[PDB]
Amino acid sequence: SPACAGRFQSPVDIRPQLAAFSPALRPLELLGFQLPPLPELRLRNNGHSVQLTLPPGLEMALGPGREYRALQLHLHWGAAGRPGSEHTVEGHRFPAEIHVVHLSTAFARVDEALGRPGGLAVLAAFLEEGPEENSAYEQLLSRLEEIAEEGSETQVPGLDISALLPSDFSRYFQYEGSLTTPPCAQGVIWTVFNQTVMLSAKQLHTLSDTLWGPGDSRLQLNFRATQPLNGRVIEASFP
Amino acid sequence: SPACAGRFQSPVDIRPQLAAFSPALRPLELLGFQLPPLPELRLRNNGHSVQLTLPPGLEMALGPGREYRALQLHLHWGAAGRPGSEHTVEGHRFPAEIHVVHLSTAFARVDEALGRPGGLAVLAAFLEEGPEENSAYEQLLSRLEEIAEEGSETQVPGLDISALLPSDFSRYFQYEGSLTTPPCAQGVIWTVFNQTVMLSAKQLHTLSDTLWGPGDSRLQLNFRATQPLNGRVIEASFP
Ligand SMILES: NS(=O)(=O)c1c(F)c(F)c(SCCO)c(F)c1NC1CCCCCCC1
Ligand SMILES: NS(=O)(=O)c1c(F)c(F)c(SCCO)c(F)c1NC1CCCCCCC1
Ligand SMILES: [Zn+2]
Ligand SMILES: [Zn+2]
C-alpha cells in the first residue's frame, strides 16, 4: 500500500516540550456516549484488533461547528511484559492504547472521508497498569474468550463508552496524520489524551493473551512503528 | 441559502487581545505564483466584485500537510471617503481587501469542498493608502475601464500574483468561517495578514469609482456586515 509511505503518517512520538500550546483548543465534547444495555453491540476479532461497533447518536466536537459521530472503537496492545501502545511519549511505550474512531458530520460515508482533511478523527488514550480492576474495561475483556478465534464475533450489552476514557477532557495533544493500518489514509485528526486510564495487570494480560490472529499466530504486538513528524507540530490544549 | 444563517459566518471583527497565540502557525508558503505573461488571465466584473481567474499550478500551504491550489482572487472596497474591507480590526474598517481563494488538494472540485472542514482556504489582506503607485495592482486597475459594465471581462497578462499580497507571510490571524456570498458555506479557513498592502489614493479611487453593478448602480461598498464570532477563538501566529 504506497500510501503507507506518505509524508504525514501515524503514530508519532509525542515530545511535550516541543508541543505548541494553543488556548483555542477547547475541552472535548462527547454526548450520547452513555449507552443503555439494549441494543447490544457487535464485538469482533478481525485478526488485527478487537473492534466494538458503535450505534448512531455518539456525537463529538473538536471545536465550534467541528462535529463528528463515533463509528467504532478498538485497541492496540503488547505481549507478556512488553508494551504495545502506538503513540509513545518521549520514547516511552505504554501497555496499550484505545482508539475511538469518528466520522465528520460533513461526510455521509467513510470512503468519502478517507484522505480528506478532518474527514476522520480518532480519540486516543493510553492504558497503564494500576492496582484496581477497571469495571468499564472488564465489560469488554471478559468477552474476549468468546471471540478468541480470528474472525469470530459476539454481542455485548451497551455500556458507557465515555467511561473508557481519561478524567480530563480539557488536556490533550492533537495533530494530523494517518490510519495506522492499510490503507494508511492521511488527513486523520488524532487527539491523544494527556492523562491515562488504569487497568489491573490481570486485565492487561487478558487483553494480550486471549485473541488469535492469522495462521497459528497470537494477536499481540498489533502496533505500528513510530513515524516522523516531517515538520508537523503537535499541539497541546494546556500550557 | 440557509447556510447564510449559520452560526459560524464570515467576515468577523478581529480583536487581537482576544486572539490565541499558536506557535504551530508557521509562515505561509506559495509556489508557482510568479506567472509568465502568456497565457493571459481573465479579469471579470461579475456585478459583486472584480475577479481574476487563476491558472493551474499555484500551490499554497498553510502548513506541512495542509496543501491548497489557488482558484481566483477578487476585491472588496468602499466608496469616496468610506472604507469597504470585509474584516475589521477592533472595529476599524480598512479602505479595501483582497481575497485569494484556494481549494484543498483532497478535492477535485469546489462543489465537493463546500461545507467540508478545510475544503476551501482564503488568504485575505487589507489594502491601505500609500504614497506610491503599486505596480502589481496597476496591471489590474488600469483595466477596470474596459470592464465597467456588469458582466464584462477582459484578458490580462500573467503577473506576480504574490506581489498583490504583503511580503510578511509570518504574521497573521487565522480562523474558521464561511464564504461571504451565497451559498455562505462553512468550513472555510480564513487567514488574515497582519501587514497591509499599499495602493495610491488614485488607485483606490479607480477601484471604487470605475465599475458598475446590478440596475443602474455603481459597484461600491461590496462588503458583507461583520458576523459574530459566536465562541470561535481567532488564532494568531505571533504573541
Ligand atoms: N488505528 S486505526 O484507527 O488506523 C485502525 C487500526 F489500526 C486497525 F488495526 C483496525 S482493524 C483492521 C482493519 O484493517 C481498524 F479498524 C482501525 N481503524 C479503521 C477506521 C475506519 C477507516 C477504514 C478502515 C480501517 C481503519
Ligand atoms: N469573499 S468570498 O470568497 O466569499 C467571495 C465573495 F465575497 C464574492 F462577492 C464573490 S463574487 C462572485 C460570486 O457571486 C466571489 F466569487 C467570492 N468567492 C468565491 C470563491 C469560489 C468558490 C465558491 C464560489 C463562490 C465564492
Ligand atoms: Zn487504532
Ligand atoms: Zn471575498
Numbering used by the authors:
A (entry chain A), B (entry chain B): 20 to 50, 50A, 51 to 54, 54A, 54B, 55 to 72, 76 to 82, 84 to 125, ...
Paper text:
Human carbonic anhydrase IX (CA IX) shows limited expression in normal tissues and is significantly up-regulated by hypoxia-inducible factor 1α (HIF-1α) or other alternative microenvironmental factors in a variety of tumors. CA IX is crucial for cancer cell survival because bicarbonate and protons, produced upon CA IX-catalyzed reversible hydration of CO2, are necessary to maintain the cellular pH balance: bicarbonate is transported into the cell to neutralize intracellular acid, while protons increase extracellular acidification. Therefore, CA IX has been proposed to be a promising tumor hypoxia biomarker for diagnostic and targeted drug delivery applications. Sulfonamides are classical CA inhibitors, where the deprotonated sulfonamide group is required for displacement of the catalytic Zn2+-bound water molecule to bind directly with Zn2+ in the active site to inhibit CA.
Therefore, the binding affinity can be enhanced using inhibitors with the lowered pKa of the sulfonamide group. Introduction of fluorine atoms that lower the pKa due to their electron-withdrawing capabilities is one of the choices due to unique features, such as high electronegativity, small size, low atomic weight, and contribution to increased lipophilicity. We expanded this strategy and created new routes for functionalization of pentafluorobenzensulfonamides including para-, ortho-, and meta- substituted fluorinated benzensulfonamides. The bulky hydrophobic groups at ortho or meta positions are necessary for the favorable hydrophobic contacts with the amino acids of CA IX binding pocket. The sulfonamide moiety and trifluorobenzene cycle of all observed ligands fit in the conserved region of the CA IX active site, the cycloalkane tail moieties were guided towards the hydrophobic part of the active site and moieties with terminal hydroxyl group were located in the hydrophilic part of the active site. The sulfonamide amino group formed a coordination bond with Zn(II), as observed in many other CA-sulfonamide complexes. All four crystal structures showed that some conformational changes have occurred in the CA IX active site pocket as compared to other known CA IX structures. X-ray analysis demonstrated novel, previously unseen conformational changes in CA IX active site due to ligand binding. Our compounds exhibited high affinity and selectivity towards recombinant CA IX, reached nanomolar CA IX-dependent functional effects as well reduced hypoxia-induced acidification in a variety of cancer cell lines.
